[PDB]
Amino acid sequence: SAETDVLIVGAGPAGAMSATLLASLGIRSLMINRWRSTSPRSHIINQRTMEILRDIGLEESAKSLAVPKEYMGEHVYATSLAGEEFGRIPAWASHPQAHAEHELASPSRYCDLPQLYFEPMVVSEAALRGADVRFLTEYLGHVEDQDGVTARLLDHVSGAEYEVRAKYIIGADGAHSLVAQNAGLPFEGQMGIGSGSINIEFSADLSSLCEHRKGDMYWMFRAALRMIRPWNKWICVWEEAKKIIHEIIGDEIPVEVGPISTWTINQQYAVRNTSGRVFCMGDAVHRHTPMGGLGLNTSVQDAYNLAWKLALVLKGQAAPTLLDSYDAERSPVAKQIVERAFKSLSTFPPVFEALSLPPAPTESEMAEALVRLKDASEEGAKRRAALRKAMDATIIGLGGGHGVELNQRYVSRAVFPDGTPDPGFVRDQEFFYQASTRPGAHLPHVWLTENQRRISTLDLCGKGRFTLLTGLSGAAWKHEAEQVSQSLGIELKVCVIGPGQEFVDTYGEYAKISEIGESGALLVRPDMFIAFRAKDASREGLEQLNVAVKSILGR
Amino acid sequence: SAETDVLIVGAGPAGAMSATLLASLGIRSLMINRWRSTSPGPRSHIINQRTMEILRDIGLEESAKSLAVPKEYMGEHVYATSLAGEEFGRIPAWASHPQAHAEHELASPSRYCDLPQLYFEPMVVSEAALRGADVRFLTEYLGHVEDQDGVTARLLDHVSGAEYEVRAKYIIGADGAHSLVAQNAGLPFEGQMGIGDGSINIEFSADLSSLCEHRKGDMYWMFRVGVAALRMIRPWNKWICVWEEAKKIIHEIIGTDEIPVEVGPISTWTINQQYAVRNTSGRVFCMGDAVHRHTPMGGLGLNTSVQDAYNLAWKLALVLKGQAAPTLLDSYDAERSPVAKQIVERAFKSLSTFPPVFEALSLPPAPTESEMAEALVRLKDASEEGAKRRAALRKAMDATIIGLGGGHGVELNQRYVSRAVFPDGTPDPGFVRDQEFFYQASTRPGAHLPHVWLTENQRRISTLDLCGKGRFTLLTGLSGAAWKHEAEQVSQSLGIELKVCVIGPGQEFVDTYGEYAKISEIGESGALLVRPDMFIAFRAKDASREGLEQLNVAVKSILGR
Amino acid sequence: VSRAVFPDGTPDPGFVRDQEFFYQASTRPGAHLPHVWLTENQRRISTLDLCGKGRFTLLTGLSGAAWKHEAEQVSQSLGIELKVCVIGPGQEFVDTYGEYAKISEIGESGALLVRPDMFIAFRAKDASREGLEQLNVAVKSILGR
């Protein structure tokens, strides 16, 4: 037997990130994993995940191993890699305007970094920061009571079974989570919808076909060809029958075949992610197709939302009520993600409609469509246009869904409403991010300066602590904040932004972006979400802070 | 209880590398470690070409390069009063001198780089597990017993609390400098562990780009203990000082209050010069710091530990698969124990290069702020006495370079002599130039395969890239096609893989520059048999039938059959 | 070899290695000034960067401060500009690597007179008065005066 604070079952990206964050806040975690190693899957890393690595100080590492945005831009649709292109779309915000909306949304950027490298990076940091990490250990089951939970583990090295006592359990096993099964969580959706896919990993120098048109992926109508390491290591998606490959490249280039695997099509999510003392996290509560990068990025953000709350509760600085906001804030996102990824598969058939093709067409029918495309008639013009309209529409699954990625709007006991009407979105909320400074939104990024050197507004804010932001007219918040930290037992950094100060807004972006006068203030959560906002530093505003905080923490 | 082929105790660079390589060759390893994680502490960071070659064989080179600081940022070693104070002078460290750099480029396709063991370790531990090794941290080796069929060790699990047994065919002791595995195996050591009356390592953080970016180096040494060092961990930003808020010893070393400083952990180093005279004791093989414990002068610790693992894995693999007799494992001691003694003696001897600096300034060791100040102004003196002092100091400073990148020979000039190299009946050449300072390429058996550039599809490839992959390789020119057939016969005959490359104009690999012709000391029809670990075990002048007959014998001999 | 180089009495060394394939730095008059790295403000500067600018330049170490005064006297005397660089630990221009010491075939107090076109016209072993007297002659001679 053994005792710890939190038991994390699973060391995929969500469990690992959970361990890292709990270790960074002084909480004892034991992380476990049935398998011998990290996953040998996902690869698009979006801005929200990069911001979190930036908060933890792992951003520079990930960028070192990741392929940059500049190499991810050209999505090509073709007959084969060596054959003729139907056309290209500007993927992963490579279009100048998409890129601008990208830059303004965050200090971080897209990059490609196979889960294969990501996982061990984070598992090793978690152990470095203080988490205990044991692989080849299988969760068999648990029982809860009023004071905590006891789980039974099976050790695949020693052979022994032993018990672990813990105050909480995080179910971060994968898409077949036994932890979710035992906690009794309800799911909606199915796990094999219809055709799945076959994933042939392989190696081959394709620089001559790719360096003049750099992209993350190359899709063929005849299946996908995705880059793992620039122009060199690859998967094909669809034993020496894997010269299906030669067909997809379109013999001349030598090829070593790696492992092959199978994917199914899923659309299932948990309606509720918590069940007294058990919290479930990543693929365990949202299982979906790969369309859009959303799986890994959502999983890490699940862990970022929960850690700080658990920490606070385990230290008596907050009431267990606070843990309910994990479900309120995070379950919607899971449903959203699952529905989005599936819906993104509908954007492909319309490509065949534009070529007048049935699905699974035959080499003849294809060949006809290709020459109709080259036709100098008005019928051929219509086709050309139809194909364009169709191809452009696929972009939602391929970098255009910026709104889905960033426009979280939490509503829970952990955000204190300011009395403002919910504004909607001016533009489409799946395609476009809308910065909001209203409570429940994520803190907008703008550039300030510290010592004439650019710093993001987000760099003022993480570090496992609440932060409160203001201008010079709002010095009063400094004193009001100290009083509240003293009164309730919690850290509360206060930044006064302006001309004299450490942080100044040399560009006026902070003034422009907040929807609020200089003397107003934003209370930012450890997870970077705004929990409270005041118009000004009036005494009515200043009295509210202390209440907002007691309320947020359940006290 | 549990069973596995090899039990590796320790997950420092040698144990981890061992696990990776054995997993890559299809061998079941369990690697264990007392601690909760990889080494956090300030330890090794200079990665030399031999270690980079090995990563290049394993395909981890591009990863390490991504996280490592390049050679170009490592060049300026400055000696000064303080970082903000006045420089006594600079030497061109880590082969930054144009000529040192040429000798570097020619010696290998790889390059120096700085990568804190802190990142190196987890890189390799995760690859080992990915390639098939079982890896368990928080597990302590308590002891073992051997017999005729293998070994049984007792382990203590610090998570579950349980003790259990592990049965294995062999054990690799890669715990550190206090190896309990070495103690139980009964290995003999020579040398001591605390030589005199050591060093304190203060980790800290602070943006020093204004003081360093115009003169990029790995280290900045201060004469002020007489001496203290300031080493870069992440370019201009994360640091250790070497020598609780008394750690503004630091402010003294930087020489200013103005730059804000966050203090990290502090630790202590001692001066060691101790190595094992013998690294093997029936069925137990000891590996890194466990058999060579020494000071940090020259980068040699980590690099030697990884190469210990590269020498052994393939041999263990062959033996465990019945392709080789247990005799082959004796060459680990023959080939590797000398290098341990060499490394330890070199690192310690590199500390003698410092006192002569004080002699050149007429200073006693541990001088006082006044005496120092006098020496500085004598140095600036427009007299002939002052000229002599200047020159003395130069002669002294230059001599320290052996510990700071000049020891290229120590790094690369291994010459194995063991049952695992088959002599060709060439006279031993010596070294034309100093064998500590200068690498000498040799193609004679027992030497490491030289690097030269060939082309595959008009693209440069190293001779070394034809050669690892856990297998023996045989190299030749077109006049030597006969070796192809002879090689097949021997692979069929004994049960082992044996790649053959015929280098030339028509072929896959060609030597577009003539470097292969120039470098081998051998005619086109001759051949080199290269080991998995990149060392030449056999060489033939030509492809005559007398030469061709020998191959089969050399191979049966090397493998003990 | 011409009236515009003042021989220092040193035998011509030859070339150790083939003179078509390999450069040999020399500091003997008639040769081109060798390059080595010095520092100005801890930033690398070439020895050649001390030296052009349409003017004669004279190079020395600290033990050679006497050349500063001697040089001024000669500029005043004949009507020409003559920069003087004293290379060393205190100064503008220091040889942080010791290359200057290593490369010149000359003690610290010695000096090299470099022509506008970067060729050495005069070299002195040291700053003795016999050496210092020569400068004025070397210069009159070089200019035909």
Residue numbers in the entry:
A (entry chain B): 4 to 43, 46 to 199, 201 to 228, 239 to 254, 268 to 279, 281 to 585
B (entry chain A): 4 to 200, 202 to 228, 236 to 254, 268 to 585
C (entry chain C): 441 to 585
Authors' description from the paper:
The breakdown of the biaryl core was initiated by the ortho-hydroxylation of the substrate to yield 2,3-dihydroxybiphenyl (23DHBP). This aromatic hydroxylation was later attributed to a class “A” FPMO, 2-hydroxybiphenyl 3-monooxygenase (HbpA), which was isolated and characterised. Mechanistic studies confirmed that HbpA shared many of the catalytic characteristics of class “A” FPMOs such as PHBH. The monomer of HbpA broadly resembles the class “A” FPMO aromatic hydroxylases PHHY, RebC and RdmE of established structure and consists of three domains: an FAD nucleotide binding domain (D1) containing residues 4–76, 96–197 and 295–374; a “middle” domain (D2), composed of residues 77–95, 375–427 and 198–294; and a C-terminal domain (D3) incorporating a thioredoxin-like fold formed from residues 428–585.
Although lacking the FAD coenzyme, the apo structure of HbpA has proved useful in providing information on secondary structural elements and residues that are missing from the FAD-complex structure. In the apo form, the amino acid backbone was complete from residues Ser4 to Arg228, Ala239 to Trp254 and Glu268 to Arg565. In the apo structure, the backbone Cα atoms of Arg242 and Met243 on strand β15 in D2 closest to FAD, for example, each move 2.5 Å away from the binding site in a superimposition of the two structures. The relative shift in domains is coincident with an absence of some electron density in regions in the FAD complex compared to the apo structure. These include density for the loop 195–203 that connects domains D1 and D2 as well as additional loops between the seven β-strands of domain D2, including region 245–249 between β15 and β16 and region 213–219 between β13 and β14, which features the short helix α8 in the apo structure. The reasons for the mobility of these loops on FAD binding are unclear; they correspond neither to substrate entry channels—as proposed, for example, for RdmE —nor to the region of the protein that would move as a result of FAD moving to the “out” position, as also observed in RdmE. In HbpA, helix α11 forms one side of a hydrophobic channel, the opening of which also includes the mobile loop 195–203, as revealed by the apo structure. The mobility in this region of the protein could mean that it serves as a gateway in HbpA for entry of the aromatic substrate.
